[PDB]
């Protein structure tokens, strides 16, 4: 709220040098991925000319700490926080003026590392940086830079999925979701390993075999690379992306087939351990798609995705809450109320973006309060007219809520219990309890 409107606006290259440097320093958040050699691998804001000396400084500081056998995990400078992650040859540093915790910035840097490792498998990365530490990774990362930039933009905008390390799901009936999963099973192929149906970035259905299990890290990686980044639209149509899925197998290449269900943007993802399966997976999709319109489930999916997150009044009749964010510790999945209630009905992109950023920053402050290291906090209430907020971290779930300041803890606890009760009532209709057969 201190210049966030132009924070996502990139630094123009036509400006002279010192104005560009001042603009770069004025950015609220910076993501800097580099090698152990200090070479600029990727920067969210500004080209490598702008960030080159700064990245060298960061690398030599971390290398100072590595030489002292005491790895550096980050440091604070007033309101600014620098978080440093060392994933082998790769050094990730996040500079935040938005007051996030070390854990949240570390999770965001871990997500960036996850995307990079998905681009090229871990043994290949380690070998290319070991047998040649003087390696510029920007070569193989030619197509990955746009995805990383968009993912970092989503992080700055406020990513609840990354904050909670979970995923969102369509509010589908349990019978309807079971029918969709059974339709998914009725068209299955031996080469198919991980089936996935998503609608508007929200999980719809998951298909996994008995032996191999779909780790939540893999799902987070897929959603970050496709829906959080929004790069799935790029090269629209059939999309045969080689993949890594390091949680499943980081030493090998899977292959994910992405298709648009336009026959809001419903997507079908099919991950197979063989490169030649694509055509067969194509025959899979036409088999699945034809089943969906015939049974009408595709139209239902599109209609459910078209309506966004349910409004706070509809979820809780006559509630003082403006928004909430409920995460279930099992099933690793979350849900939230519509963001349209925060902003006035007639608003521009900048106003809605500012409202989302404010609410998300409140949520990350609450999340940091709950998950402070060596602090067994269970409930946290704050008053940032004002704006009251509560966060509850029962070992079975995790709920954050925001209301106008004229509510108080007494009523806010009642509202939090109410929304938790609603989520428990609709647990089967909100979360993927189990995968496919």
């Amino acid at each position: 709220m201190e210049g966030f409107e132009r924070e996502l606006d990139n630094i123009p290259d036509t400006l002279p040098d010192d104005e560009r440097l001042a603009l770069w320093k004025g950015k609220l958040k910076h993501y800097l991925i580099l090698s152990s050699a200090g070479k600029p691998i990727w920067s969210r804001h500004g080209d490598l000319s702008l960030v080159n000396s700064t990245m060298g400084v960061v690398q030599t500081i971390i290398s100072f700490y590595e030489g002292a056998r005491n790895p550096l995990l980050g440091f604070t400078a007033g309101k600014v926080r620098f978080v440093i992650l060392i994933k082998g040859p790769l050094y990730f540093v996040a500079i935040s003026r938005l007051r996030e915790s070390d854990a949240q910035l570390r999770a965001q840097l871990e997500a960036l590392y996850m995307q990079i490792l998905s681009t090229l498998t871990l043994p290949i990365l380690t070998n290319i940086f070991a047998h040649r530490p003087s390696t510029d990774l920007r070569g193989p990362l030619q197509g990955t830079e746009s995805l990383l930039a968009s993912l970092a933009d989503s992080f700055t905008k406020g990513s609840p999925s990354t904050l909670l390390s979970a995923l969102e799901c369509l509010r589908l009936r349990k019978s309807q979701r079971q029918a969709i999963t059974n339709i998914f099973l009725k068209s299955r192929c031996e080469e198919l390993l991980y089936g996935l149906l998503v609608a508007g970035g929200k999980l719809v259905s998951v298909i996994r075999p008995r032996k191999h299990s779909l780790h939540p890290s893999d799902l987070q990686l897929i959603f970050n690379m496709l829906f959080e980044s929004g790069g799935i639209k790029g090269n629209g149509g059939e999309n045969w992306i080689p993949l890594c899925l390091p949680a499943f197998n980081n030493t090998g290449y899977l292959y994910m087939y992405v298709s648009f269900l336009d026959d809001d943007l419903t997507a079908l993802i099919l991950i197979s351990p063989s490169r030649e399966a694509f055509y067969a997976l194509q025959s899979m999709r036409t088999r699945l798609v034809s089943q969906l319109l015939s049974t009408g489930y595709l139209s239902l999916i599109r209609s459910t995705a078209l309506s966004g997150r349910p409004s706070i009044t509809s979820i809780l009749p006559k509630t003082p809450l403006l928004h909430f964010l409920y995460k279930s510790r099992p099933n690793v999945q979350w849900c939230m109320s519509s963001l349209s209630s925060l902003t006035p009905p007639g608003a521009t992109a900048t106003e809605t973006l500012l409202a989302r950023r404010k609410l998300m920053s409140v949520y990350e402050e609450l999340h940091a309060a709950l998950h402070a290291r060596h602090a067994h906090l269970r409930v946290v209430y704050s008053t940032a007219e004002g704006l009251a907020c509560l966060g509850w971290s029962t070992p079975a779930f995790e709920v954050y809520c925001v209301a106008p300041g004229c509510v108080g803890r007494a009523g806010m606890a009642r509202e939090v219990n109410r929304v938790v009760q609603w989520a428990r009532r609709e647990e089967e209709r909100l979360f993927i309890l189990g995968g496919g057969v």
Binding site: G78, A372, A375, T383
Partner: protein, 453 residues
């Protein structure tokens, strides 16, 4: 085989002292490490490799400061989180920095955990309190100390004071972290004496007696009296190297004539004297004639204070301290630098004792006054007074078990850090152990209710 958390190293440096090469070692006006600190710890040789490590650490801190000058728009690096240590960089004043890396607990390869280590806010508060005490015992400000006494004398004084302080410093959580993080003046449980007529139970006549002592006694500028411990029962109460209790604290502050910052410094020195009697800085050895007087007016030991502008007496004073000690009470009396002669000290001491001994019983009666289980902590930012009820951490019968004490105090420090309340909105945070912390900002008091199950 668990290695406890200890101060990995500490250093005080002025970057403006070392400009060119072969003057970088002049930057480190003080340096200490655990191996160096061992001798001082027992009481209270450097080589090229160690000097290289010291210069590397100081240059690394300066490099972080300069690198973050651009991003933070003037704010320097204050906290550094590393795998094996927690580093605190505090700018004590303009151009003077103290960098302290505290080694985390090693658990048998090693696993490095900071479960019991003080948070960065509390470590910075302790370092600032030590720096304020050093200023209290030496000059007005470190820059003035240097420009007056030369870098060699500054190095000697810093070495002595900081070796003594770091010998007894506990990087782990201990005592009352909630009171320690705020700094300020820790008032006793009774608070202050009665201001005017009608509060004689709290010590209104007692406060009048103290004020008349200030005015009547020649050369007396200020008086602060604090209660530490209990009434007389071989006691050896003034030592024990223990911790200041929750009830212990300043009872009657100055009559004015002292800035609240320097008044806080004097009160902290009183606490240090109570904890480290005969071992505190200045060596407050009890008088041979009578044990009531220690650090008499008769080595002209004088502490340096800044007087309040609303006083006749540009504001530095260099007053002379005299500590009159009773079993429960400690009176620190700040006399003028020259007006009371040391020659008349034997005569002045008898009058002082005759004017404070009859005060002992009424003072004991008045300080005994007190204003599910609820603990609060009111810290008035304007007047720096701190009145708290949160119990201190028991040493390894209080109403607390030690584990609960550490958990509660670490939690409280977490709310203070999150609430941006430490000097250097309502935050209501609960837990699964039945503790309900409620931090409120009174409009400038900062209350911290600590409701228990």
């Amino acid at each position: 085989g668990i290695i406890p958390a200890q101060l990995g190293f500490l250093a005080i440096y002025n970057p403006a002292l070392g400009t060119t090469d072969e003057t970088l070692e002049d930057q480190i006006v003080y340096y200490a490490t655990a191996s160096t600190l061992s001798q001082a710890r027992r009481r209270h040789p450097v080589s090229k490799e160690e000097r290289h490590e010291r210069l590397r650490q100081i240059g690394l801190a300066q490099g972080m400061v300069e690198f973050a000058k651009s991003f933070s728009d003037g704010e320097p690096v204050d906290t550094i989180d590393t795998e094996k240590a927690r580093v605190i960089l505090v700018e004590v004043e303009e151009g003077w920095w103290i960098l302290a890396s505290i080694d985390l607990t090693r658990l048998p390869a090693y696993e490095y955990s900071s479960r019991e280590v003080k948070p960065p806010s509390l470590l910075r508060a302790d370092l600032l309190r030590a720096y304020d005490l050093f200023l209290l015992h030496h000059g007005s400000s470190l820059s003035s100390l240097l420009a007056s006494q030369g870098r060699a004398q500054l190095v000697a004084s810093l070495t002595r004071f900081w070796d003594h302080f770091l010998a007894t410093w506990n990087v782990l959580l201990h005592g009352n972290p909630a009171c320690d993080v705020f700094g300020g003046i820790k008032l006793a449980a009774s608070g202050e004496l009665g201001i005017g007529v009608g509060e004689e139970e709290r010590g209104s006549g007692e406060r009048e007696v103290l004020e008349g002592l200030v005015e009547r006694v020649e050369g007396l500028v200020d008086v602060v009296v604090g209660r530490y411990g209990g009434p007389p029962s071989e006691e050896q109460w003034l030592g024990l190297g223990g911790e200041v209790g929750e009830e212990d604290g300043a009872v009657f502050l100055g009559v004015g004539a002292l800035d609240r910052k320097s008044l806080r410094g004097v009160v902290q020195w009183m606490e240090e004297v109570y904890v480290w009697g005969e071992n505190a800085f200045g060596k407050p050895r009890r008088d041979l004639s009578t044990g009531h007087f220690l650090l008499g007016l008769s080595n002209p030991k004088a502490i340096f204070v800044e007087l309040k502008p609303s006083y006749q007496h540009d504001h530095t004073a260099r007053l002379r301290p005299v500590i009159y000690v009773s079993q429960p009470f400690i009176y620190i009396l700040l006399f003028s630098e020259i007006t009371p002669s040391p020659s008349t000290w034997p005569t002045l001491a008898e009058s002082l004792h005759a004017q404070l001994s009859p005060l002992q019983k009424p003072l004991l009666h008045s300080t005994s006054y007190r204003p599910h289980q609820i603990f609060d902590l009111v810290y008035d930012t304007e007047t720096l007074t701190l009145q708290s009820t949160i119990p201190n951490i028991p040493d390894p019968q209080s109403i607390w078990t030690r584990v609960e004490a550490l958990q509660t105090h670490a939690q409280i420090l977490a709310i203070l850090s999150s609430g941006r309340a430490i000097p250097t909105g309502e935050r209501t945070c609960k837990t699964a152990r039945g503790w309900w912390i409620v931090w409120t900002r009174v409009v400038g008091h900062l209350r911290s209710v600590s409701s228990s199950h």
